């Protein structure tokens, strides 16, 4: 490895763009860098932001675990778009429809738990009755004090 | 029979 195989500053002339596209081993027409807003990408290519899950699993890759080839320009977020991580693959349902159905289901279930909390079910009985003034000494009541007499009657 | 050799890394060390 040497100097003119390392990334450089943002390309401005078309021959600097062609030299960078040769450097990253890809076509000049397919080479797009990140836009020069000063964020610090240099001449590094903006690859189309796909996970490695979308790569062809039947192709004989140079790195079969990564679905990546030798000499291929890696994505900037290759550590992020591994198959152990963020997947961008096409989903059988639309993304917005998934988000609407999941948010509506969670919100409806929380609203109905709140309604059922506001309107609780119970049984047609009185409170459970206990001897010895609703169990005063058993519930940790001090014996120096004397509670009010809680008397329960037969029915 | 027909036992196959099992390539495994060096377990001696």
């Amino acid at each position: 490895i040497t100097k003119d195989m390392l990334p450089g500053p943002y390309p401005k002339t078309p021959e600097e763009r062609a030299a960078a596209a040769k450097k990253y081993n890809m076509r000049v027409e397919d080479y797009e860098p990140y836009p020069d807003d000063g964020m610090g990408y240099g001449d590094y290519p903006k690859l189309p932001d796909r996970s490695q899950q979308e790569r062809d699993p039947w192709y004989d890759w140079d790195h079969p675990d990564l679905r990546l080839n030798w000499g291929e320009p890696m994505h900037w977020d290759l550590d992020m778009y591994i198959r152990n991580r963020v997947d961008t693959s096409p989903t059988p349902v639309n993304w917005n429809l998934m988000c609407k159905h999941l948010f509506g289901f969670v919100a409806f279930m929380l609203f109905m738990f709140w309604v059922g909390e506001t309107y609780p079910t119970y049984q047609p009985v009185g409170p459970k009755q206990y001897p010895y003034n609703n169990l005063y000494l058993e519930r940790g009541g001090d014996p120096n004090k004397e509670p009010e007499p809680v008397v329960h009657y037969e029915i | 029979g027909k036992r196959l050799f099992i390539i495994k890394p060096s377990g001696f060390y």
């Binding site: 062809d56 699993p57 039947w58 192709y59 004989d60 675990d65 059988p92 349902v93 | 196959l4 050799f5 099992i6 390539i7 495994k8 890394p9 060096s10 377990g11 001696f12 060390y13």
Partner: protein
């Protein structure tokens, strides 16, 4: 699209890949074999109707809206074979696929445990290191200027010469080590 040999997919290949994906997702939808067999013959009829279509624009349009048909009517969890990618047993045994060069780093007391295997391995290593320079000069004389156009490898042409770049295809590990 993405192939090692070709640079693209033909229209006929796209239609066949659509037909196979449609039968597999239909089999996922139509679990029982007689019912799948019925609807698979119906799908074969739907592909045989526009089969003898010589207008490439009309065939391309029918292929495109047939892909929209397939996308609207795909099974969300289709049947995947277990060793197929996505399947429940895919790349399971890759932790047991130790490469061949790890046998070179064994201690001699465990190479003495298998004398005939390593004695038969040394002639493979010898055969490879005599085949190597001939297969390199085979590749450099057949590949055109500017590098190879496709990823296809040429076979061996003489007798006694091995095919070029054969070692990591032949000495790859098994599927059940």
């Amino acid at each position: 699209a993405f192939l090692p040999s070709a640079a693209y997919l033909t229209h006929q290949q796209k239609v066949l890949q659509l037909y196979k994906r449609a039968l597999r997702h239909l089999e996922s939808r139509c679990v029982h074999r007689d019912k799948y067999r019925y609807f698979a013959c119906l799908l074969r009829a739907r592909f045989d109707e526009h089969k003898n279509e010589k207008d490439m624009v009309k065939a391309t349009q029918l292929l495109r809206e047939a892909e929209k048909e397939f996308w609207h009517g795909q099974h969300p969890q289709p049947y995947i074979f277990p060793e197929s990618p996505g399947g429940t047993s895919y790349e399971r045994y890759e932790c047991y696929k130790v490469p061949e060069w790890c046998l070179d780093d064994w201690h001699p007391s465990e190479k003495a445990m298998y004398p005939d295997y390593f004695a038969k391995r040394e002639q493979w290593k010898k055969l490879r290191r005599e085949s190597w320079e001939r297969e390199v000069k085979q590749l450099q004389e057949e590949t055109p200027v500017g590098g190879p156009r496709t990823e296809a490898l040429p076979p061996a042409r003489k007798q006694g010469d091995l095919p070029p770049l054969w070692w990591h295809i032949v000495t790859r590990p098994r599927e059940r080590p």
